[PDB]
């Protein structure tokens, strides 16, 4: 059916126009880059001074904090919080043979953009909404935890102690159980959906003038790869500055009534990850060469395996 494909000049104009708006969108509008994330945050932050009332960036984060603590069984998806969280994430992603003076001026610039966000109380805002998520790995934890790293980037110390006293004056269990439910609902190298992907990849073009939407299904095996590295990078940078009271708090919560001990569930996920890559090796132990599909999925599994290796060593690098 490739050869009976109709050309464009025999196609009608209205269906030729809808293929133009979709093609101009994917080639020109998606590829265009703009840096409006910096300029909006600095003008709301210089809006604190005018001719002790809350600043407009401070007004926004307590509005994001109050809509977290209302009693509801689940959290609603808010497009406005997802859209403001990645603006605050890329506002600090600008600074994240070189000399000595230039690297510290990149560092004190980055701790300035993190000072511009977290003195308004954004460090407690991210922890309220992992607490109110209750184990649902929706689109919103991808937006708040990428904000949670960019505030905690580089081993900053005043952001961590502002997080630690907040979980000690509240003493509310539900932040640590949510990391536990977010950890066990991560995907590994499955060997059941991998042959389903290999059989469906052979259909290069579907009949009656259809290009197969490869981005809709994506990769069935290790589809949740970014977030389970985005979660473990957040847990690595929590104890990056060798702070001893965090690794005693994450191990045993003596203030709360129920201890969770993330460090055991870290080993439980990596033991689950060990047997998946080992069984992925035993499936490919008889074949000679590996195709581009297998080395894609193996480097996907080994990169998250290095992140949990970096998450585990910073838990034990402190004395």
């Amino acid at each position: 059916a490739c050869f009976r494909m109709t050309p464009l000049y025999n196609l009608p104009t209205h269906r030729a126009c809808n293929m133009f708006l979709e093609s101009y969108k994917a080639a020109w509008i998606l590829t265009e880059d703009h840096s409006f994330e910096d300029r909006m945050i600095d003008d709301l932050s210089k809006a604190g001074e005018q001719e002790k009332k809350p600043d407009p960036l401070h007004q926004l984060v307590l509005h994001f904090s109050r809509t977290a603590l209302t009693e509801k069984s689940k959290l609603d998806e808010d497009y406005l919080y997802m859209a403001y969280a990645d603006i605050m994430a890329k506002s600090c992603h600008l600074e994240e043979e070189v000399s000595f003076e230039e690297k510290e001026m990149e560092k004190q610039r980055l701790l300035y953009q993190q000072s511009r966000l977290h003195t308004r109380g954004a460090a407690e805002m991210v922890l309220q909404m992992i607490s109110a998520c209750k184990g649902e790995t929706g689109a919103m934890v991808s937006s708040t935890l990428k904000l949670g790293i960019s505030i905690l980037n580089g081993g900053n110390a005043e952001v961590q102690q502002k997080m630690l006293d907040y979980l000690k004056d509240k003493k509310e269990v539900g932040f640590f159980q949510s990391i536990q439910a977010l950890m066990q609902t991560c995907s590994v190298l499955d060997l059941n959906a991998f042959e389903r992907q290999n059989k469906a990849e052979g259909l290069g073009m579907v009949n009656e003038d259809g290009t197969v939407i490869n981005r809709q299904n994506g990769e069935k095996v290790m589809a949740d790869d970014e977030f389970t590295q985005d979660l473990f990078r957040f847990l690595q940078l929590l104890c990056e500055g060798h702070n001893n009271d965090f690794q005693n708090y994450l191990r045993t919560q003596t203030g709360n009534t129920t201890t969770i001990n993330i460090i055991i569930c870290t080993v439980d996920y990596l033991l689950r990850l060990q047997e998946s890559i080992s069984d992925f090796y035993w499936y490919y132990s008889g074949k000679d060469v590996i195709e581009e599909q297998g080395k894609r999925n193996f480097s996907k599994a080994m990169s998250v395996a290095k992140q949990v290796f970096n998450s585990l060593t910073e838990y034990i690098q402190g004395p």
Partner: protein, 771 residues
């Protein structure tokens, strides 16, 4: 007593304002029949006089502006705001001469210009109380009010309100600044979103908002306003940004029709040069990949790649980059207040630097407004897949479709009753013969048509109350998944709910579940196992308990459900068998799941012989006392369940090339199914003599039909096969020659049913074993 004495009464002030809110809440949410009956109590002359009367008290003035929009301007306002999100622009010549900037790079006024997006009219009806009352009413429209005099009055009291706010009087209209500006602004906002205001009128609203920026007295934004007035102005400026977005989408679609008229003319001229080109052979197919071989979607993606392999010359590739830098300069990107985005952004922050906003409705509406102005290109890309383009010869039926889809979304906000059900049937009954539903399948999916039908199936399924409503909706989604294949993929996401409520007469949501996975190998191979364990647990329920509908009607007691479980077995043939080739992943997981539960099979194989069960099935079907005593018969449903059980075990069998390999999985499955069902039981069933129709007609729901033997020969051809000759001539003698001489004598519905049985099932078997 005068209505102006209630400002000192303060008791019947409270009663009449509480009566007026009852006058609003009764005729609310699109109930026009009471809204005409309320028009007798509150006259239009006494309601338009109360708009400009400044001596009226506070809450009484605020309720009268809310009353008139509740009785006249809400059924038409809700329909167009629901239609303002999607963009349907036809290729009329009014569209082809539109630019982003007005000719005379200075940005024009928002809301001023020409638009061609199709939106349904408001459909007003004049009120009358002396007409003859008929007799079910078909539909009753919103009551008509003259909008030509109401719009000039609405601009006059707003024009007086902004001018009286500069003098700073001690006694404003209503007693406070909130009661002066909020009821006039929300009424100016609602007649603007319905769309009666002319171009000169909207130039006057922008001069009253800000006379410095919008010029082609003190402005309304520079004045100090309380938080209630600030919230109604964000809804006013959300309109102008949506109109600025709609003008930007129509200019992008106007440029597209001006481009592809030049694009298809260039490429056919390049093909006419290529067919006269005999100077190369290896490069001749390299130029012809896009022209004949590549699909027409991949041509547009490959031809528009000239930024930073494109056969377009230098004449027709700069005009799009001339359009591209014109579009980003129309947005907030510089690409190197006096504009709308610079006015709104400095206003939201100045409202935020004034004092702490304690109202959460405004501060979210403030930051959602500020995010829309800076992220302008992101707002366009998220709104463009809901933007379509049709031919101008289809506008007479497309607005007939949007008037009827607006009927359903106006019926979604009210709970279903005995009369709103039949309006839903006639509405979906008109969408399926409007001829636009079939030629453009990608636009029905963009309008939210399939979502509006499923939420009415959510609210009714939750026993069922309206069975006529639920069958017409699932029938609509069954025929929706066969117009195009991507219409079926948006339904595959909903299968966890569509299969949970499958376990009544007519169509059932399992038919939507069956139509979502039929004839498409992509959705069949991407099906999870979690949707498959629900079907076999529903099938394990039919083996121990019987039908609740049968024993309540008076049927004899039988320990299992044949007709109920047959609906789950014919569902699973569609998953394990796609386009005549059996999948291996879904067949491996359905055989693994069925054999752990012995109740999913029949009680004979769970142990009597299978022919002995079907010979007992003829015994109950021939006898009138043992049979059902009306269309469902017990004696036919038992073999219909077994033939659905047998051919399911046939279509999940592996093909011959998996047995030819060294796969230990394929001969394991064939060893289970050969040892699950014996051979000589099937040799007897295929040899069963049937009642031949000759000189009288039998009943098909009360006799043996040859569709059961077609299940047995397909399972015998697939898990057993024919290898030798004594097995070959035995089943050929005893099984098909009483079938074929019976068809030779009928040279009648059984004559046509067994003739389809021969040429579909046995004659492909004989040609398989022909050498």
């Amino acid at each position: 007593m005068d209505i102006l004495e209630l400002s000192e009464r303060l008791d019947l002030q409270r009663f009449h304002s509480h009566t007026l809110r009852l006058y609003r809440a009764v005729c609310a949410l699109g109930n026009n029949r009471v809204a005409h009956a309320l028009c007798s109590h509150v006259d239009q002359a006494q309601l338009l006089h109360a708009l400009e009367d400044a001596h009226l008290p506070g809450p009484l003035r605020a309720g009268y502006y809310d009353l008139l929009i509740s009785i006249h301007l809400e059924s038409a306002c809700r329909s167009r705001r629901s239609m303002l999100s999607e963009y349907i622009v036809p290729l009329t010549p009014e569209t082809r001469a539109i630019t982003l900037f007005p000719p005379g790079r200075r940005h024009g006024l928002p809301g001023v210009g020409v638009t061609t997006s199709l939106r349904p009219p408001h459909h007003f009806s004049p009120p009358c109380f002396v007409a003859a009352l008929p007799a079910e009413a078909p539909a009753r429209l919103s009551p008509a009010i003259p909008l030509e005099a109401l719009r000039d009055k609405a601009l006059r009291m707003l024009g007086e309100a902004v001018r009286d706010g500069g003098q700073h009087a001690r006694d404003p209209v209503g007693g406070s600044v909130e009661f002066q500006f909020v009821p006039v602004l929300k009424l100016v906002s609602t007649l603007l979103v319905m769309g009666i205001f002319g171009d000169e009128d909207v130039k006057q609203i922008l001069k009253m908002i800000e006379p410095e920026v919008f010029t082609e007295e003190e402005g309304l934004l520079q004045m100090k306003l309380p938080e209630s007035v600030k919230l109604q102005m964000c809804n006013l400026l959300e309109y102008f940004c949506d109109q600025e977005l709609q003008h930007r989408v129509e200019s992008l679609a106007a440029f597209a029709e001006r481009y592809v008229d030049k694009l298809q003319a260039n490429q056919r001229s390049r093909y006419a040069l290529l067919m006269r080109a005999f100077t190369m052979s290896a490069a001749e197919t390299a130029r012809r990949t896009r022209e004949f071989r590549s699909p027409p979607q991949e041509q547009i993606n490959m031809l528009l790649h000239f930024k930073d392999d494109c056969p377009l010359p230098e004449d027709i590739r700069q005009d799009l980059q001339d359009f591209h830098q014109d579009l980003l300069a129309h947005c907030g990107i510089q690409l190197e207040p006096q504009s709308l985005q610079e006015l709104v952004s400095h206003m939201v922050v100045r409202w935020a630097q004034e004092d702490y906003v304690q109202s959460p409705e405004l501060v979210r509406a403030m930051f959602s407004l500020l995010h829309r102005q800076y992220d302008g290109l992101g707002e366009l890309l998220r709104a463009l897949p809901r933007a379509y383009t049709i031919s101008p010869s289809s506008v007479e039926d497309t607005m007939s479709l949007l008037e009827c889809l607006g009927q359903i979304r106006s019926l979604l906000i009210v709970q279903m009753g005995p009369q709103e059900e039949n309006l839903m049937i006639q509405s979906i009954g008109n969408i399926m013969n409007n001829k636009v539903f079939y030629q453009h399948p990608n636009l029905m999916r963009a309008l939210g048509m399939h979502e509006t039908v499923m939420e009415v199936m959510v609210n009714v399924l939750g026993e069922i109350r309206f069975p006529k409503m639920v069958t017409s909706c699932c029938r609509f989604l069954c025929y929706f998944c066969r117009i195009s294949r991507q219409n079926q993929r948006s339904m595959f996401d909903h299968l966890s709910y569509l299969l949970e409520n499958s376990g009544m007469q007519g169509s059932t949501p399992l038919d939507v579940a069956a139509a979502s996975v039929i004839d498409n190998n992509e959705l069949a191979l991407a099906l999870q196992e979690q949707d498959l364990e629900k079907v076999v647990s529903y099938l394990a329920g039919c083996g121990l308990q019987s039908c609740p509908m049968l024993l309540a009607k008076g049927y004899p007691d039988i320990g299992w459900n044949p007709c109920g479980g047959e609906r789950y077995l014919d569902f699973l043939r569609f998953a394990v068998f796609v386009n005549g080739e059996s999948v291996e992943e879904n067949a491996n997981v359905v055989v693994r799941l069925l054999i752990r539960k012995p109740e999913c099979f029949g009680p004979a194989l769970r142990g009597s012989g299978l022919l002995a069960a079907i010979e007992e099935a003829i015994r109950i079907s021939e006898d009138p006392a043992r049979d059902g005593p009306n269309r469902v018969h017990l004696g036919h449903a038992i073999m219909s369940f077994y033939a659905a059980l047998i051919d399911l075990l046939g279509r999940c069998a592996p093909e011959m090339h998996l047995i030819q390999a060294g796969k230990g999985e394929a001969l394991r499955i064939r060893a289970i199914l050969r040892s699950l069902v014996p051979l000589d039981d099937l040799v007897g069933i295929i040899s069963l003599p049937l009642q031949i129709p000759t000189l009288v007609q039998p009943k098909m729901s009360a006799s043996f039909v040859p569709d059961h033997k077609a299940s047995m020969v397909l399972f015998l051809d697939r898990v057993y096969g024919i290898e030798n000759q004594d097995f070959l001539l035995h089943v050929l003698d005893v099984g098909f020659l009483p079938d074929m001489r019976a068809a030779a004598s009928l040279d009648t519905e059984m004559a046509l049913a067994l003739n389809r049985y021969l040429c579909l099932a046995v004659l492909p078997l004989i040609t398989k074993c022909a050498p």
